[PDB]
């Protein structure tokens, strides 16, 4: 009947989402700026920031690395998506 | 618009009635034969890249034409610019995809 999410559902749909089944040229292992690219690179930087902190302060990587307990300043992937800069 | 032709849904995968396919294929093959009989131009068109070489090889065997590459905007509506003054357009286009 009354949905609080309706107020902001349409605003966040252009800022945090794009339509169509298209993946960026950069996202492949191997131009004109687009808004979808900003979304496709913003989410990866957050996932890698969340996921690369689940390795430094966890035991999977190694025993010395686990002891290092390395917190991260920021994660930022290159627009070309050639490599990452953690 | 495809639901008329679907025999049913087998655990999520739509099945195509092969009886309607047989009737429709008979008409389509029959039409394609009279066009070829009358010496019309037939163009095979597809953008599926797995079958690009097969479809180009098929057209060459038939004696007809294939366009499996990127289709330029205006190829048919603006043919005279793209091809020349008196270019003859295809009389039939077969869309494998």
């Amino acid at each position: 009947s009354k949905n609080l999410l309706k107020k902001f559902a349409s605003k966040t749909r252009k800022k945090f989402w794009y339509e169509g089944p298209s993946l960026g040229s950069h996202l492949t292992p191997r131009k004109k700026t687009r808004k979808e690219d900003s979304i496709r690179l913003r989410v990866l930087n957050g996932l890698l920031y969340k996921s690369l902190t689940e390795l430094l302060c966890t035991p999977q990587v190694s025993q010395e690395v686990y002891d290092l307990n390395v917190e991260l300043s920021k994660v930022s992937v290159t627009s070309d998506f050639s490599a990452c800069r953690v | 618009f495809m639901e008329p032709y679907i025999f049913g849904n087998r655990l999520g995968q739509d099945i195509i009635d092969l009886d309607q396919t047989a009737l429709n294929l008979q008409l389509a093959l029959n039409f394609t034969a009279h066009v070829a009989y009358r010496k019309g131009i037939i163009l095979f068109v597809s953008r599926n890249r797995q079958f690009s070489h097969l479809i180009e090889t098929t057209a060459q065997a038939c004696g007809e034409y294939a366009h499996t590459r990127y289709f330029k905007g205006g190829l048919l509506t603006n043919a005279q610019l793209l091809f020349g003054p008196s270019v003859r357009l295809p009389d039939l286009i077969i869309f494998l995809h």
């Binding site: 689940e54 302060c57 966890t58 686990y66 002891d67 307990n69 | 049913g8 655990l11």
Partner: protein, 97 residues
Amino acid sequence: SNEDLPVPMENPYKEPLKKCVLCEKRVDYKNVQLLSQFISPFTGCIYGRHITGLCGKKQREITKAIKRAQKMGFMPVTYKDPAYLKDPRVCNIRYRE
């Protein structure tokens, strides 16, 4: 007409619905050992249903039992009891180093 035509029926292979780890179980305020499995060891804060993995109905049942146990003198508010630190881990959350 045709003997081999498909027969209407409910899906024989329909997969069962997944249940929560507290489905069809009694959540009691006096069972502080079970309630402690859904709070934080350090702060004692109740976990959300995205961490606990419970359904809505059980998430509310655990929430009410924790608040009742805390307010009646059964469960500590600010931390998890050290006795229950060894109980199985059922929540998708990691805190160590």
